[PDB]
Design a protein around this ligand. Structure first.
Ligand SMILES: [Mg+2]
Ligand SMILES: [Mg+2]
Ligand SMILES: [Mg+2]
Ligand SMILES: [Mg+2]
Ligand SMILES: [Mg+2]
Ligand SMILES: [Mg+2]
Ligand SMILES: [Mg+2]
Ligand SMILES: [Mg+2]
Ligand SMILES: [Mg+2]
Ligand SMILES: [Mg+2]
Ligand SMILES: [Mg+2]
Ligand SMILES: [Mg+2]
Ligand SMILES: [Mg+2]
Ligand SMILES: [Mg+2]
Ligand SMILES: [Mg+2]
Ligand SMILES: [Mg+2]
Ligand SMILES: [Mg+2]
Ligand SMILES: [Mg+2]
Ligand SMILES: [Mg+2]
Ligand SMILES: [Mg+2]
Ligand SMILES: [Mg+2]
Ligand SMILES: [Mg+2]
Ligand SMILES: [Mg+2]
Ligand SMILES: [Mg+2]
Ligand SMILES: [Mg+2]
Ligand SMILES: [Mg+2]
Ligand SMILES: [Mg+2]
Ligand SMILES: [Mg+2]
Ligand SMILES: [Mg+2]
Ligand SMILES: [Mg+2]
Ligand SMILES: [Mg+2]
Ligand SMILES: [Mg+2]
Ligand SMILES: [Mg+2]
Ligand SMILES: [Mg+2]
Ligand SMILES: [Mg+2]
Ligand SMILES: [Mg+2]
Ligand SMILES: [Mg+2]
Ligand SMILES: [Mg+2]
Ligand SMILES: [Mg+2]
Ligand SMILES: [Mg+2]
Ligand SMILES: [Mg+2]
Ligand SMILES: [Mg+2]
Ligand SMILES: [Mg+2]
Ligand SMILES: [Mg+2]
Ligand SMILES: [Mg+2]
Ligand SMILES: [Mg+2]
Ligand SMILES: [Mg+2]
Ligand SMILES: [Mg+2]
Ligand SMILES: [Mg+2]
Ligand SMILES: [Mg+2]
Ligand SMILES: [Mg+2]
Lengths: 117, 54, 141, 48, 150, 103, 109
RNA sequence: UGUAACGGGGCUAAACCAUGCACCGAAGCUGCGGCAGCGACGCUUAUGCGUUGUUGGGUAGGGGAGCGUUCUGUAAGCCUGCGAAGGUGUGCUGUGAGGCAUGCUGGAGGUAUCAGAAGUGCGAAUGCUGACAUAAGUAACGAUAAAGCGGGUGAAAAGCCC
RNA sequence: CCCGGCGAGGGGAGUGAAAAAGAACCUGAAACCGUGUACGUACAAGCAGUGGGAGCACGCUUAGGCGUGUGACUGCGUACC
């Protein structure tokens, strides 16, 4: 009987402050604005995971297109030639190869052209 | 005419930045008394340009 | 892990192009591509990996259709009635260097990075430059 | 068999329904009364 | 709550909340919405249920071997030392004693012992029968318990 | 030299002696794993591209350890609809070391 | 070393920092003349605590005078006496008699 | 109000009507790992030990399972001045409410497991009390009858005395 | 004992296990206001976060590289009931 709620509330607010560490203004000092910020951060990350996936996908595609155009072929033609040659290498490794080992990418585009034409 | 949103400590400090103080650039020394007084003013004893007026 | 570009170790080359007999919409796009670095495998969204491009004979740019009389360039000074209107021929006759710059700025992304990319375009109005010390390479469109 | 080892049966001691003590329990602000009705007011209930 | 049934301020005009009484639980030093009243928590247990519980407790004590039977348990003087020595030689420290006839000397000896309690066959309680580590029961109490239960 | 393989839907490029994080494998903490579904091997201007796999490319790895990944917090929230939901997650991972690569 | 404090003073927590911020890192010889020739009331209050710190350093630690330097100084808020200022139409205005806690730390270096 | 009836740059196609082959393109579908429910089947149940299929957006609302706090019995038991409760940080852990260990301050009570009873969990109600910010060192310093100077006391005077 | 108005207040000495237990006195959190250190910021537009991420400072480094703090730049994103 007569349960006081001081320590529980203090811990529950200190956890929110710890989560909201590094924010600007009241978002890192009070509880009323911090809760609206930590909740808004989870909602952002829940979408930004898929957004990171899409951004990395389109960056790998852009790098592959750049390397293909430097070699003398288009990105769509390169992908079509790879699929007709029935290889299974992915965009991330293709972009990494184009960045680091360029002669390997030249061999890949030659293989694609041989199967395409 | 009253505010609608609470200002911030950053804006308060930016406003107060121009409310600082400027110290004395340098002091003057009497030729014979060797004291330190303000420019073009007299000392605490009554000396000015070496002469005595008090 | 995905490779990223570092502004300190990245290299930039100098290219020179003549805008004689080519179109704005098919030259400024290539300029924007080579300024954003989409022609290099080291392309990154947040790093300016592009090359310094110099443009010569900007007054000799060729435009088809009736755009030389119907191509207006609206802008606003900031005042209530501060609206101005020009045309392609007036722009060429008065400030010819500001006909490629508008197109390239519109095509480039808007922001500090876009402004940094735009800072590399040395657009001139003649057939000579003063950047021969950089040893530029001639480029075709 | 002691006071610290004695337990009741299963399914006999039900917890109980608490109204307006959270959002995750299912009985939120309304507490099973609805939105702005005679049935959702303090002492508001039609007779039999 | 000792106070006055007067509105601290009028309904409108003032730019504060609505006040109708100072004794409001929302305010400070006010009343309680669901203030408690003296209530009786005594539940109801059927006679058959109580007897069955006692039978189960006794049968479980027999299985756990924490219940013993002695034909005669008494102390010749109302002194605690004699009872303490009698329990020590039988190796009992936390024990309950049940007797058919109340012995004044035994009761006086067990009064000053925390882990020793002397009870009649009629006054037994399941809580004590469970709590006490050991239980001792004479025949004169076993027969009375059998007659009470059956 | 380096090689490209796949384990768990994803693909990984790795050289000799490097450590790789993969999905939870039903292997012990000191055993050896053979990857035969290799895709490419490059050793300094002698490349071999599989169609789709290489004829004899094999990757030998030692399972260094297992574990669980970094904590992930999941928050769902509906504006003015009286709905919020909290969740936690930790993905199981297996760390291995590439002992050898053969063509 | 050899701190000096003045607590429960009669001033504001903002009007003293303006003169406190111009003697940070300065020598005692310059800090005293600047305070004497400063035309603010807080100058006297800061000079009193500076003299107390100098005297305490010279009497307790045996420090010199020409070697001293004001290596630290800060003023914090204190209790605020609450008073009412009469206002029209039967209103009231809570005015707070501000105080300050001035602290100076002078090191030998 | 300022282009202002392609989103913009710009386009004589980078526009439209017709053919085809590629690519991009979603929390849609496939691959890997992980959690939970329902139903089938042999688990002779350990009520779960393998399968297999399927499902798992969600307001009002219904059902089910749980976390945390006070007190009571277990408890004249256990921890604790070789440092308790509480406060402030770190690390680890669980799907979750949370839990565990410990550094420092703190300086004397706290309480395992299993059960029981609730003043049992706050962000809002122009909610109440207390404290502290903001506007801000801004207005104002309360009849525009008026003050100036020379001496005195005092650490210091325009305002105290002559 | 000294500064200071024979003050207020504080620094020394002393008692006390403890004086950031000194009478505004057990424990002393939060809002709020200060000092010191690391990083970023004066061509830059918006619920101020999130994903990616250069650089900088510190401490371990089995030199591998990670961690903590800062977060130029960039995609997305108009608080709660
Ligand atoms: Mg930050
Ligand atoms: Mg803080
Ligand atoms: Mg592919
Ligand atoms: Mg408004
Ligand atoms: Mg100002
Ligand atoms: Mg954009
Ligand atoms: Mg009830
Ligand atoms: Mg509901
Ligand atoms: Mg309502
Ligand atoms: Mg309605
Ligand atoms: Mg209704
Ligand atoms: Mg009513
Ligand atoms: Mg009346
Ligand atoms: Mg009262
Ligand atoms: Mg009361
Ligand atoms: Mg009866
Ligand atoms: Mg108009
Ligand atoms: Mg996708
Ligand atoms: Mg799906
Ligand atoms: Mg699966
Ligand atoms: Mg559901
Ligand atoms: Mg679904
Ligand atoms: Mg109590
Ligand atoms: Mg208890
Ligand atoms: Mg301790
Ligand atoms: Mg307690
Ligand atoms: Mg604690
Ligand atoms: Mg503790
Ligand atoms: Mg208990
Ligand atoms: Mg309550
Ligand atoms: Mg509150
Ligand atoms: Mg208000
Ligand atoms: Mg409120
Ligand atoms: Mg102010
Ligand atoms: Mg003024
Ligand atoms: Mg103003
Ligand atoms: Mg003014
Ligand atoms: Mg004024
Ligand atoms: Mg005035
Ligand atoms: Mg007056
Ligand atoms: Mg006046
Ligand atoms: Mg006078
Ligand atoms: Mg006067
Ligand atoms: Mg004193
Ligand atoms: Mg005490
Ligand atoms: Mg205290
Ligand atoms: Mg604090
Ligand atoms: Mg800048
Ligand atoms: Mg702005
Ligand atoms: Mg990151
Ligand atoms: Mg609410």
């Amino acid at each position: 009987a007569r349960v006081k709620r001081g320590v529980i509330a203090r811990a529950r607010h200190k956890k929110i402050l710890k989560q909201a560490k590094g924010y600007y203004g009241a978002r890192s000092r009070v509880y009323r604005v911090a809760f609206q910020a930590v909740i808004k951060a989870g909602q952002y990350a829940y979408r930004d995971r898929r957004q990171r996936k899409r951004q990395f996908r389109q960056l790998w595609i852009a790098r592959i297109n750049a390397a293909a155009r430097q070699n003398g072929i288009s990105y769509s033609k390169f992908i079509n030639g790879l699929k007709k040659a029935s290889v299974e290498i992915d965009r991330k490794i293709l972009a990494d190869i184009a960045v680091f080992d360029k002669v390997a990418f030249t061999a890949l585009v030659e293989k694609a052209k041989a199967a395409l034409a | 005419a009253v505010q609608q949103n609470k200002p911030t400590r950053s804006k308060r400090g930016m406003r107060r930045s121009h409310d600082a103080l400027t110290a004395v650039t340098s002091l003057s020394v009497d030729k014979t008394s060797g004291e330190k007084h303000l420019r073009h003013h007299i000392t605490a004893d009554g000396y000015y340009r070496g002469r005595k007026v008090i | 892990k995905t490779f990223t570009a570092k502004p300190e170790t990245v290299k930039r080359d100098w290219y020179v192009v003549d805008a004689t007999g080519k179109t704005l919409g098919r030259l400024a796009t290539e300029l924007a591509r080579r300024l954003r670095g989409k022609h290099k495998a080291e392309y990154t969204p947040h790093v300016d990996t592009g090359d310094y491009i110099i443009v010569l004979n900007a007054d000799k740019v060729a435009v088809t259709g009736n755009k030389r009389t119907d191509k207006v360039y609206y802008h606003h000074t900031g005042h209530i009635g501060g609206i101005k209107q020009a045309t392609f021929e007036e722009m060429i006759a008065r400030r010819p260097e500001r006909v490629i710059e508008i197109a390239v700025k519109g095509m480039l992304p808007k922001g500090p990075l876009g402004r940094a990319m735009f800072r590399k375009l040395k657009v001139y109005a003649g057939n000579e430059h003063n950047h021969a010390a950089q040893q530029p390479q001639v480029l075709d469109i | 068999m002691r006071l610290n080892t004695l337990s009741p049966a299963e399914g006999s001691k039900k917890a109980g329904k608490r109204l307006g003590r959270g959002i995750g329990s299912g009985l939120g602000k309304t507490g099973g009364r609805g939105h702005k009705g005679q049935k959702s007011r303090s002492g508001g209930g039609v007779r039999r | 709550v000792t106070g006055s049934g007067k509105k601290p301020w009028r309904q409108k005009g003032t730019g504060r909340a609505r006040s109708g009484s100072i004794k409001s639980p929302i305010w400070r030093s006010g009343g309680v919405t669901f203030a408690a009243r003296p209530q009786d928590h005594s539940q109801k247990v059927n006679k058959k249920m109580y007897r069955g519980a006692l039978k189960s407790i006794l049968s479980e004590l027999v299985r756990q071997d924490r219940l013993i039977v002695v034909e005669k348990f008494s102390v010749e003087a109302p002194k605690t030392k004699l009872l303490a020595q009698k329990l020590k030689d039988m190796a009992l420290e936390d024990v309950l004693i049940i007797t058919g006839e109340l012995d004044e000397n035994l009761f006086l000896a067990a009064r000053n012992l925390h882990k020793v309690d002397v009870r009649d066959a009629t006054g037994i309680d399941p809580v004590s029968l469970i709590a006490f580590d050991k239980v001792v029961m004479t025949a004169d109490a076993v027969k009375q318990v059998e007659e009470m239960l059956a | 030299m380096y090689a490209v393989f796949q384990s768990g839907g994803k693909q990984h490029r790795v050289s000799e002696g490097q450590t790789v994080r993969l999905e939870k494998l039903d292997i012990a903490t000191g055993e050896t794993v053979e990857f035969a579904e290799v895709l490419m091997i490059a050793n300094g201007e002698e490349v071999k591209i599989g169609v789709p796999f290489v004829d004899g490319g094999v990757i030998k790895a030692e399972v260094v350890a297992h574990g669980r990944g970094e904590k992930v917090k999941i928050v769902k929230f509906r504006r003015r609809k009286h709905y919020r939901k909290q969740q936690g997650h930790r993905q199981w991972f297996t760390d291995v070391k590439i002992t050898g690569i053969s063509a | 070393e050899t701190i000096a404090k003045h607590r429960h003073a009669r001033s504001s927590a903002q009007k003293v920092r303006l003169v406190a911020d111009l003697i940070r890192g300065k020598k005692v010889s310059q800090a005293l003349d600047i305070l004497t020739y400063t035309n603010k009331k807080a100058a006297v209050l800061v000079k009193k605590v500076l003299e107390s710190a100098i005297a305490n350093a010279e009497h307790n630690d045996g420090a010199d005078i020409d070697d001293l330097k004001v290596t630290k100084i800060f003023v914090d808020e204190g209790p605020s006496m609450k008073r009412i200022m009469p206002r029209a139409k039967g209103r009231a205005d809570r005015i707070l008699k501000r105080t300050s806690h001035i602290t100076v730390v002078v090191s030998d270096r």
